[PDB]
């Protein structure tokens, strides 16, 4: 979207998140991931690999 | 908003933050009709969400 984003007056910077990368032999269990609605499906956990 | 001759200005109330993760649980202090057009009694507690 924007490689250099200026913190807007309407935005507070909570932090910067490093990319979580899964190797060819790796999986992670994402606690509380969104569905397609963009809303946090808490409690759930989605295993992501590959 | 330029205050009138009678309006004593109180604190600036900001809109609460409502994402689908959260819902605002509030109690009506008295009979009125909300912005959505729903009659509420003098203490009925309901939820306002992103919907």
Curated annotation (Swiss-Prot), chain A:
Cellular location(s): Cytoplasm; Nucleus
Disulfide bridge partners, by residue number: none
Q: Domain of life, per the record?
A: Eukaryota
Q: How is it modified after translation?
A: Phosphorylated on Tyr residues after EGF stimulation. Dephosphorylated by PTPN11.
Annotated MVP repeat ranges: 19-50
What does this protein's UniProt record list under function?
A: Required for normal vault structure. Vaults are multi-subunit structures that may act as scaffolds for proteins involved in signal transduction. Vaults may also play a role in nucleo-cytoplasmic transport. Down-regulates IFNG-mediated STAT1 signaling and subsequent activation of JAK. Down-regulates SRC activity and signaling through MAP kinases.
Please give the record's comment on domains. Answer: MVP 3 mediates interaction with PTEN. MVP 4 mediates interaction with PARP4.
Task: Summarize subunit and interaction data from the UniProt record for this chain.
Answer: The vault ribonucleoprotein particle is a huge (400 A x 670 A) cage structure of 12.9 MDa. It consists of a dimer of half-vaults, with each half-vault comprising 39 identical major vault protein (MVP) chains, PARP4 and one or more vault RNAs (vRNAs). Interacts with TEP1. Interacts with PTEN and activated MAPK1. The phosphorylated protein interacts with the SH2 domains of PTPN11 and SRC. Interacts with APEX1. May interact with ZNF540.
Protein name per UniProt: Major vault protein
Organism, as annotated: Rattus norvegicus
């Amino acid at each position: 979207d924007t490689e250099a984003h200026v913190p807007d007056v309407y935005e507070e910077v909570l932090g910067v998140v490093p990319i979580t990368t899964l190797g060819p032999r790796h999986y992670c269990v994402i606690l509380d991931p969104m569905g397609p609605d963009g809303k946090n499906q808490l409690g759930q956990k989605r295993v992501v690999k590959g | 908003y330029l205050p009138a001759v009678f309006e004593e200005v109180l604190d600036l109330v900001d809109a609460v933050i409502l994402t689908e993760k959260t819902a605002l649980h509030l109690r009506a202090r008295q009979n009125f009709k909300d912005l959505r057009g729903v009659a509420h009694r003098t203490g009925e507690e309901w939820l306002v969400t992103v919907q």
